[PDB]
Write a protein that binds this ligand. Structure first.
Ligand code: FES
Length: 109
């Protein structure tokens, strides 16, 4: 399915259209296309730097785990449609995704 990344001043100025594979995470699809979404804990579901908001298609994605939910409670700019992009896997529906203006990372320099 197609994943549209909304325009992001720092990581995707004009936005982008990604052709993602079913079962593939939003993050891996983004990274293959050179969209550098931060992933501090290396896709271990232990941070919130890969946080994204699924504006369209949130219901198509597999429900978030208990471990993911706990991490999201720490996410800056949390919304009902927030997901850790390293955990959210595309299924059979096109998505519209927004990368947050900021993400909390106590280890950032
Ligand atoms: S990269 Fe750390 S939770 Fe996704």
């Amino acid at each position: 399915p197609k994943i549209v990344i909304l325009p992001h001043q720092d990581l995707c100025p004009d936005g982008a259209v990604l052709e993602a594979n079913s079962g593939e995470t939003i993050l891996d699809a983004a990274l293959r296309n050179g969209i550098e979404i931060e992933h501090a804990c290396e896709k271990s579901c232990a941070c919130t730097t890969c946080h994204c908001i699924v504006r369209e298609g949130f219901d198509s994605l597999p429900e978030s785990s208990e471990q993911e939910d706990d991490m999201l409670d720490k996410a800056w700019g949390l919304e009902p449609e927030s997901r850790l992009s390293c955990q959210a896997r595309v299924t059979d529906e096109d998505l519209v995704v927004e990368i947050p203006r900021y993400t909390i990372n106590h280890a950032r320099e």
